[PDB]
PDB file of all heavy atoms in Angstrom:
ATOM      1  N   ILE A   8      69.379  70.881  49.548  1.00  0.00           N
ATOM      2  CA  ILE A   8      70.135  71.310  50.722  1.00  0.00           C
ATOM      3  C   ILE A   8      70.939  70.186  51.416  1.00  0.00           C
ATOM      4  O   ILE A   8      72.103  70.409  51.676  1.00  0.00           O
ATOM      5  CB  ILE A   8      69.230  71.848  51.816  1.00  0.00           C
ATOM      6  CG1 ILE A   8      68.372  73.011  51.158  1.00  0.00           C
ATOM      7  CG2 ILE A   8      69.951  72.533  52.935  1.00  0.00           C
ATOM      8  CD1 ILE A   8      69.099  73.933  50.367  1.00  0.00           C
ATOM      9  N   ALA A   9      70.351  69.116  51.712  1.00  0.00           N
ATOM     10  CA  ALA A   9      71.101  67.995  52.380  1.00  0.00           C
ATOM     11  C   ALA A   9      72.095  67.623  51.382  1.00  0.00           C
ATOM     12  O   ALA A   9      73.087  66.847  51.775  1.00  0.00           O
ATOM     13  CB  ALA A   9      70.200  66.895  52.691  1.00  0.00           C
ATOM     14  N   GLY A  10      71.892  67.877  50.128  1.00  0.00           N
ATOM     15  CA  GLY A  10      72.746  67.589  49.081  1.00  0.00           C
ATOM     16  C   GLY A  10      74.244  68.263  49.117  1.00  0.00           C
ATOM     17  O   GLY A  10      74.935  67.917  48.234  1.00  0.00           O
ATOM     18  N   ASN A  11      74.354  69.214  49.901  1.00  0.00           N
ATOM     19  CA  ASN A  11      75.649  70.031  49.872  1.00  0.00           C
ATOM     20  C   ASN A  11      76.291  70.491  51.253  1.00  0.00           C
ATOM     21  O   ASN A  11      77.477  70.404  51.407  1.00  0.00           O
ATOM     22  CB  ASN A  11      75.551  71.184  48.833  1.00  0.00           C
ATOM     23  CG  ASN A  11      74.788  72.312  49.527  1.00  0.00           C
ATOM     24  OD1 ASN A  11      75.332  73.135  50.399  1.00  0.00           O
ATOM     25  ND2 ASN A  11      73.479  72.343  49.215  1.00  0.00           N
ATOM     26  N   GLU A  12      75.416  70.787  52.133  1.00  0.00           N
ATOM     27  CA  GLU A  12      75.943  71.327  53.407  1.00  0.00           C
ATOM     28  C   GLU A  12      76.917  70.415  54.178  1.00  0.00           C
ATOM     29  O   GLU A  12      77.976  70.946  54.613  1.00  0.00           O
ATOM     30  CB  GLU A  12      74.662  71.557  54.217  1.00  0.00           C
ATOM     31  CG  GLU A  12      73.939  72.903  53.992  1.00  0.00           C
ATOM     32  CD  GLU A  12      74.739  74.121  54.512  1.00  0.00           C
ATOM     33  OE1 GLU A  12      76.061  73.863  54.689  1.00  0.00           O
ATOM     34  OE2 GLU A  12      74.156  75.141  54.434  1.00  0.00           O
ATOM     35  N   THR A  13      76.489  69.180  54.381  1.00  0.00           N
ATOM     36  CA  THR A  13      77.371  68.246  55.177  1.00  0.00           C
ATOM     37  C   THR A  13      78.568  67.755  54.347  1.00  0.00           C
ATOM     38  O   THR A  13      79.630  67.371  54.872  1.00  0.00           O
ATOM     39  CB  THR A  13      76.556  67.110  55.563  1.00  0.00           C
ATOM     40  OG1 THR A  13      75.781  66.638  54.527  1.00  0.00           O
ATOM     41  CG2 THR A  13      75.618  67.524  56.711  1.00  0.00           C
ATOM     42  N   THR A  14      78.377  67.683  52.946  1.00  0.00           N
ATOM     43  CA  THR A  14      79.570  67.276  52.242  1.00  0.00           C
ATOM     44  C   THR A  14      80.614  68.334  52.089  1.00  0.00           C
ATOM     45  O   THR A  14      81.785  68.010  52.063  1.00  0.00           O
ATOM     46  CB  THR A  14      79.082  66.971  50.720  1.00  0.00           C
ATOM     47  OG1 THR A  14      78.004  66.014  50.811  1.00  0.00           O
ATOM     48  CG2 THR A  14      80.109  66.472  50.015  1.00  0.00           C
ATOM     49  N   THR A  15      80.187  69.592  52.209  1.00  0.00           N
ATOM     50  CA  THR A  15      81.152  70.680  52.286  1.00  0.00           C
ATOM     51  C   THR A  15      81.969  70.609  53.539  1.00  0.00           C
ATOM     52  O   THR A  15      83.215  70.788  53.596  1.00  0.00           O
ATOM     53  CB  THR A  15      80.445  72.076  52.269  1.00  0.00           C
ATOM     54  OG1 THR A  15      79.841  72.287  50.915  1.00  0.00           O
ATOM     55  CG2 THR A  15      81.425  73.195  52.644  1.00  0.00           C
ATOM     56  N   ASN A  16      81.225  70.188  54.657  1.00  0.00           N
ATOM     57  CA  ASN A  16      81.937  70.165  55.930  1.00  0.00           C
ATOM     58  C   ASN A  16      82.863  68.923  56.023  1.00  0.00           C
ATOM     59  O   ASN A  16      83.857  69.004  56.577  1.00  0.00           O
ATOM     60  CB  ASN A  16      80.851  69.961  57.115  1.00  0.00           C
ATOM     61  CG  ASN A  16      79.943  71.093  57.304  1.00  0.00           C
ATOM     62  OD1 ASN A  16      80.299  72.263  56.964  1.00  0.00           O
ATOM     63  ND2 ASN A  16      78.787  70.888  57.917  1.00  0.00           N
ATOM     64  N   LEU A  17      82.468  67.907  55.382  1.00  0.00           N
ATOM     65  CA  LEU A  17      83.361  66.656  55.348  1.00  0.00           C
ATOM     66  C   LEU A  17      84.581  67.008  54.549  1.00  0.00           C
ATOM     67  O   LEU A  17      85.673  66.472  54.986  1.00  0.00           O
ATOM     68  CB  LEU A  17      82.474  65.572  54.592  1.00  0.00           C
ATOM     69  CG  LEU A  17      83.361  64.216  54.275  1.00  0.00           C
ATOM     70  CD1 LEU A  17      84.045  63.682  55.475  1.00  0.00           C
ATOM     71  CD2 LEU A  17      82.414  63.221  53.669  1.00  0.00           C
ATOM     72  N   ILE A  18      84.579  67.606  53.377  1.00  0.00           N
ATOM     73  CA  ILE A  18      85.718  67.841  52.580  1.00  0.00           C
ATOM     74  C   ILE A  18      86.584  68.907  53.442  1.00  0.00           C
ATOM     75  O   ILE A  18      87.745  68.697  53.531  1.00  0.00           O
ATOM     76  CB  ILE A  18      85.344  68.468  51.346  1.00  0.00           C
ATOM     77  CG1 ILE A  18      84.711  67.386  50.442  1.00  0.00           C
ATOM     78  CG2 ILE A  18      86.534  69.064  50.558  1.00  0.00           C
ATOM     79  CD1 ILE A  18      84.033  67.902  49.148  1.00  0.00           C
ATOM     80  N   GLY A  19      86.073  69.845  53.962  1.00  0.00           N
ATOM     81  CA  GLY A  19      86.823  70.789  54.785  1.00  0.00           C
ATOM     82  C   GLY A  19      87.418  70.182  55.996  1.00  0.00           C
ATOM     83  O   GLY A  19      88.513  70.461  56.259  1.00  0.00           O
ATOM     84  N   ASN A  20      86.589  69.408  56.833  1.00  0.00           N
ATOM     85  CA  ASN A  20      87.056  68.715  57.931  1.00  0.00           C
ATOM     86  C   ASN A  20      88.207  67.730  57.660  1.00  0.00           C
ATOM     87  O   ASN A  20      89.111  67.601  58.315  1.00  0.00           O
ATOM     88  CB  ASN A  20      85.933  67.978  58.526  1.00  0.00           C
ATOM     89  CG  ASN A  20      85.038  68.980  59.177  1.00  0.00           C
ATOM     90  OD1 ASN A  20      85.161  70.058  59.129  1.00  0.00           O
ATOM     91  ND2 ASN A  20      83.839  68.416  59.699  1.00  0.00           N
ATOM     92  N   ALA A  21      88.160  67.136  56.351  1.00  0.00           N
ATOM     93  CA  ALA A  21      89.109  66.099  55.979  1.00  0.00           C
ATOM     94  C   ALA A  21      90.577  66.794  55.678  1.00  0.00           C
ATOM     95  O   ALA A  21      91.489  66.451  55.978  1.00  0.00           O
ATOM     96  CB  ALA A  21      88.639  65.222  54.858  1.00  0.00           C
ATOM     97  N   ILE A  22      90.307  67.902  54.982  1.00  0.00           N
ATOM     98  CA  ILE A  22      91.538  68.670  54.561  1.00  0.00           C
ATOM     99  C   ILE A  22      92.241  69.118  55.920  1.00  0.00           C
ATOM    100  O   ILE A  22      93.492  69.101  56.004  1.00  0.00           O
ATOM    101  CB  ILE A  22      91.252  69.913  53.674  1.00  0.00           C
ATOM    102  CG1 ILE A  22      90.794  69.357  52.319  1.00  0.00           C
ATOM    103  CG2 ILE A  22      92.513  70.700  53.382  1.00  0.00           C
ATOM    104  CD1 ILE A  22      90.390  70.472  51.283  1.00  0.00           C
ATOM    105  N   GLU A  23      91.495  69.507  56.868  1.00  0.00           N
ATOM    106  CA  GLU A  23      92.005  70.028  58.129  1.00  0.00           C
ATOM    107  C   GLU A  23      92.696  68.741  58.814  1.00  0.00           C
ATOM    108  O   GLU A  23      93.791  68.810  59.169  1.00  0.00           O
ATOM    109  CB  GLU A  23      90.899  70.462  59.016  1.00  0.00           C
ATOM    110  CG  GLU A  23      91.111  70.372  60.608  1.00  0.00           C
ATOM    111  CD  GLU A  23      92.215  71.246  61.128  1.00  0.00           C
ATOM    112  OE1 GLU A  23      92.748  72.226  60.427  1.00  0.00           O
ATOM    113  OE2 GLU A  23      92.778  70.932  62.226  1.00  0.00           O
ATOM    114  N   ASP A  24      91.980  67.750  59.007  1.00  0.00           N
ATOM    115  CA  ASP A  24      92.380  66.489  59.709  1.00  0.00           C
ATOM    116  C   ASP A  24      93.678  65.922  59.025  1.00  0.00           C
ATOM    117  O   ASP A  24      94.649  65.603  59.726  1.00  0.00           O
ATOM    118  CB  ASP A  24      91.324  65.484  59.846  1.00  0.00           C
ATOM    119  CG  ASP A  24      90.179  65.759  60.657  1.00  0.00           C
ATOM    120  OD1 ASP A  24      90.322  66.705  61.590  1.00  0.00           O
ATOM    121  OD2 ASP A  24      89.240  65.166  60.527  1.00  0.00           O
ATOM    122  N   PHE A  25      93.677  65.800  57.689  1.00  0.00           N
ATOM    123  CA  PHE A  25      94.768  65.214  56.993  1.00  0.00           C
ATOM    124  C   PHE A  25      96.080  66.051  57.069  1.00  0.00           C
ATOM    125  O   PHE A  25      97.140  65.555  57.278  1.00  0.00           O
ATOM    126  CB  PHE A  25      94.463  65.120  55.551  1.00  0.00           C
ATOM    127  CG  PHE A  25      93.319  64.072  55.134  1.00  0.00           C
ATOM    128  CD1 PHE A  25      93.022  63.882  53.832  1.00  0.00           C
ATOM    129  CD2 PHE A  25      92.701  63.352  56.108  1.00  0.00           C
ATOM    130  CE1 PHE A  25      91.944  63.031  53.464  1.00  0.00           C
ATOM    131  CE2 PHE A  25      91.811  62.426  55.796  1.00  0.00           C
ATOM    132  CZ  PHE A  25      91.348  62.281  54.442  1.00  0.00           C
ATOM    133  N   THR A  26      95.865  67.365  57.171  1.00  0.00           N
ATOM    134  CA  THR A  26      97.032  68.265  57.351  1.00  0.00           C
ATOM    135  C   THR A  26      97.559  68.181  58.791  1.00  0.00           C
ATOM    136  O   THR A  26      98.750  67.915  58.949  1.00  0.00           O
ATOM    137  CB  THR A  26      96.571  69.733  57.106  1.00  0.00           C
ATOM    138  OG1 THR A  26      96.043  69.755  55.738  1.00  0.00           O
ATOM    139  CG2 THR A  26      97.753  70.787  57.284  1.00  0.00           C
ATOM    140  N   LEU A  27      96.586  68.449  59.754  1.00  0.00           N
ATOM    141  CA  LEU A  27      97.126  68.445  61.136  1.00  0.00           C
ATOM    142  C   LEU A  27      97.681  67.069  61.552  1.00  0.00           C
ATOM    143  O   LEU A  27      98.850  66.987  62.248  1.00  0.00           O
ATOM    144  CB  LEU A  27      95.722  68.561  62.039  1.00  0.00           C
ATOM    145  CG  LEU A  27      95.969  68.516  63.521  1.00  0.00           C
ATOM    146  CD1 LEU A  27      97.002  69.662  63.958  1.00  0.00           C
ATOM    147  CD2 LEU A  27      94.634  68.625  64.272  1.00  0.00           C
ATOM    148  N   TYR A  28      97.080  65.940  61.150  1.00  0.00           N
ATOM    149  CA  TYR A  28      97.737  64.535  61.478  1.00  0.00           C
ATOM    150  C   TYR A  28      98.584  64.025  60.468  1.00  0.00           C
ATOM    151  O   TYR A  28      98.990  62.844  60.598  1.00  0.00           O
ATOM    152  CB  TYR A  28      96.626  63.672  61.764  1.00  0.00           C
ATOM    153  CG  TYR A  28      95.789  64.173  62.991  1.00  0.00           C
ATOM    154  CD1 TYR A  28      94.524  64.759  62.883  1.00  0.00           C
ATOM    155  CD2 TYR A  28      96.346  64.000  64.363  1.00  0.00           C
ATOM    156  CE1 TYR A  28      93.950  65.203  64.021  1.00  0.00           C
ATOM    157  CE2 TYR A  28      95.615  64.589  65.413  1.00  0.00           C
ATOM    158  CZ  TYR A  28      94.412  65.184  65.232  1.00  0.00           C
ATOM    159  OH  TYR A  28      93.709  65.521  66.387  1.00  0.00           O
ATOM    160  N   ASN A  29      99.070  64.822  59.439  1.00  0.00           N
ATOM    161  CA  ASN A  29     100.034  64.427  58.407  1.00  0.00           C
ATOM    162  C   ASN A  29      99.634  63.132  57.749  1.00  0.00           C
ATOM    163  O   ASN A  29     100.312  62.086  57.682  1.00  0.00           O
ATOM    164  CB  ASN A  29     101.312  64.217  58.947  1.00  0.00           C
ATOM    165  CG  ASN A  29     101.807  65.542  59.690  1.00  0.00           C
ATOM    166  OD1 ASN A  29     101.966  66.591  59.188  1.00  0.00           O
ATOM    167  ND2 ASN A  29     102.150  65.232  61.028  1.00  0.00           N
ATOM    168  N   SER A  30      98.320  62.986  57.146  1.00  0.00           N
ATOM    169  CA  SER A  30      97.782  61.844  56.323  1.00  0.00           C
ATOM    170  C   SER A  30      97.916  61.942  54.938  1.00  0.00           C
ATOM    171  O   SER A  30      97.595  60.939  54.227  1.00  0.00           O
ATOM    172  CB  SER A  30      96.290  61.608  56.882  1.00  0.00           C
ATOM    173  OG  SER A  30      96.088  61.726  58.115  1.00  0.00           O
ATOM    174  N   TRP A  31      98.426  63.059  54.462  1.00  0.00           N
ATOM    175  CA  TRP A  31      98.539  63.241  52.957  1.00  0.00           C
ATOM    176  C   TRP A  31      99.273  62.198  52.198  1.00  0.00           C
ATOM    177  O   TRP A  31      98.968  61.719  51.103  1.00  0.00           O
ATOM    178  CB  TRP A  31      98.899  64.516  52.651  1.00  0.00           C
ATOM    179  CG  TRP A  31      97.924  65.655  52.952  1.00  0.00           C
ATOM    180  CD1 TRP A  31      98.066  66.588  53.901  1.00  0.00           C
ATOM    181  CD2 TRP A  31      96.495  65.872  52.289  1.00  0.00           C
ATOM    182  NE1 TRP A  31      96.937  67.467  53.964  1.00  0.00           N
ATOM    183  CE2 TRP A  31      96.034  67.021  52.980  1.00  0.00           C
ATOM    184  CE3 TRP A  31      95.954  65.303  51.233  1.00  0.00           C
ATOM    185  CZ2 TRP A  31      94.747  67.519  52.533  1.00  0.00           C
ATOM    186  CZ3 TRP A  31      94.657  65.742  50.899  1.00  0.00           C
ATOM    187  CH2 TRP A  31      94.093  66.892  51.548  1.00  0.00           C
ATOM    188  N   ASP A  32     100.468  61.695  52.709  1.00  0.00           N
ATOM    189  CA  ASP A  32     101.323  60.841  51.982  1.00  0.00           C
ATOM    190  C   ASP A  32     100.481  59.546  51.991  1.00  0.00           C
ATOM    191  O   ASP A  32     100.575  58.783  50.919  1.00  0.00           O
ATOM    192  CB  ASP A  32     102.684  60.600  52.648  1.00  0.00           C
ATOM    193  CG  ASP A  32     103.646  61.717  52.515  1.00  0.00           C
ATOM    194  OD1 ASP A  32     103.326  62.530  51.548  1.00  0.00           O
ATOM    195  OD2 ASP A  32     104.554  61.856  53.302  1.00  0.00           O
ATOM    196  N   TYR A  33      99.865  59.040  53.042  1.00  0.00           N
ATOM    197  CA  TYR A  33      99.109  57.913  53.173  1.00  0.00           C
ATOM    198  C   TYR A  33      98.048  57.921  52.101  1.00  0.00           C
ATOM    199  O   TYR A  33      97.809  56.990  51.416  1.00  0.00           O
ATOM    200  CB  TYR A  33      98.519  57.773  54.552  1.00  0.00           C
ATOM    201  CG  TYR A  33      97.408  56.709  54.596  1.00  0.00           C
ATOM    202  CD1 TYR A  33      97.644  55.322  54.538  1.00  0.00           C
ATOM    203  CD2 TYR A  33      96.050  57.012  54.616  1.00  0.00           C
ATOM    204  CE1 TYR A  33      96.809  54.318  54.549  1.00  0.00           C
ATOM    205  CE2 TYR A  33      94.992  56.077  54.613  1.00  0.00           C
ATOM    206  CZ  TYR A  33      95.343  54.726  54.628  1.00  0.00           C
ATOM    207  OH  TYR A  33      94.358  53.818  54.660  1.00  0.00           O
ATOM    208  N   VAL A  34      97.290  59.098  51.847  1.00  0.00           N
ATOM    209  CA  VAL A  34      96.238  59.260  50.941  1.00  0.00           C
ATOM    210  C   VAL A  34      96.830  58.985  49.516  1.00  0.00           C
ATOM    211  O   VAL A  34      96.106  58.477  48.731  1.00  0.00           O
ATOM    212  CB  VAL A  34      95.344  60.374  51.173  1.00  0.00           C
ATOM    213  CG1 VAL A  34      94.679  60.407  52.448  1.00  0.00           C
ATOM    214  CG2 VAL A  34      96.217  61.660  50.883  1.00  0.00           C
ATOM    215  N   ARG A  35      97.849  59.700  49.179  1.00  0.00           N
ATOM    216  CA  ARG A  35      98.506  59.690  47.869  1.00  0.00           C
ATOM    217  C   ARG A  35      98.943  58.243  47.430  1.00  0.00           C
ATOM    218  O   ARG A  35      98.788  57.827  46.373  1.00  0.00           O
ATOM    219  CB  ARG A  35      99.711  60.645  47.813  1.00  0.00           C
ATOM    220  CG  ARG A  35      99.273  62.041  47.689  1.00  0.00           C
ATOM    221  CD  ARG A  35     100.521  62.964  47.225  1.00  0.00           C
ATOM    222  NE  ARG A  35     101.346  63.153  48.427  1.00  0.00           N
ATOM    223  CZ  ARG A  35     101.074  64.201  49.318  1.00  0.00           C
ATOM    224  NH1 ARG A  35     100.092  65.114  48.985  1.00  0.00           N
ATOM    225  NH2 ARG A  35     101.989  64.441  50.357  1.00  0.00           N
ATOM    226  N   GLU A  36      99.333  57.575  48.441  1.00  0.00           N
ATOM    227  CA  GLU A  36      99.861  56.119  48.108  1.00  0.00           C
ATOM    228  C   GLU A  36      98.851  55.025  48.306  1.00  0.00           C
ATOM    229  O   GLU A  36      98.860  54.102  47.513  1.00  0.00           O
ATOM    230  CB  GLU A  36     101.045  55.769  49.066  1.00  0.00           C
ATOM    231  CG  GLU A  36     100.714  55.958  50.642  1.00  0.00           C
ATOM    232  CD  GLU A  36     102.078  55.784  51.409  1.00  0.00           C
ATOM    233  OE1 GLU A  36     103.103  55.647  50.828  1.00  0.00           O
ATOM    234  OE2 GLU A  36     101.863  55.788  52.639  1.00  0.00           O
ATOM    235  N   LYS A  37      97.873  55.243  49.131  1.00  0.00           N
ATOM    236  CA  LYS A  37      96.742  54.262  49.331  1.00  0.00           C
ATOM    237  C   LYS A  37      95.300  54.781  48.833  1.00  0.00           C
ATOM    238  O   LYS A  37      94.390  53.912  48.807  1.00  0.00           O
ATOM    239  CB  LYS A  37      96.620  53.830  50.753  1.00  0.00           C
ATOM    240  CG  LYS A  37      97.953  53.594  51.563  1.00  0.00           C
ATOM    241  CD  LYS A  37      98.683  52.436  50.929  1.00  0.00           C
ATOM    242  CE  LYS A  37      99.793  52.110  51.838  1.00  0.00           C
ATOM    243  NZ  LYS A  37     100.777  51.021  51.339  1.00  0.00           N
TER     244      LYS A  37
END
């Protein structure tokens, strides 16, 4: 259980944050 619940939240939260704050170019380059 601890093996997936929070990791799912992290990936989803990151996709949200990177989109909202336009971090995708930074992640692709760095």
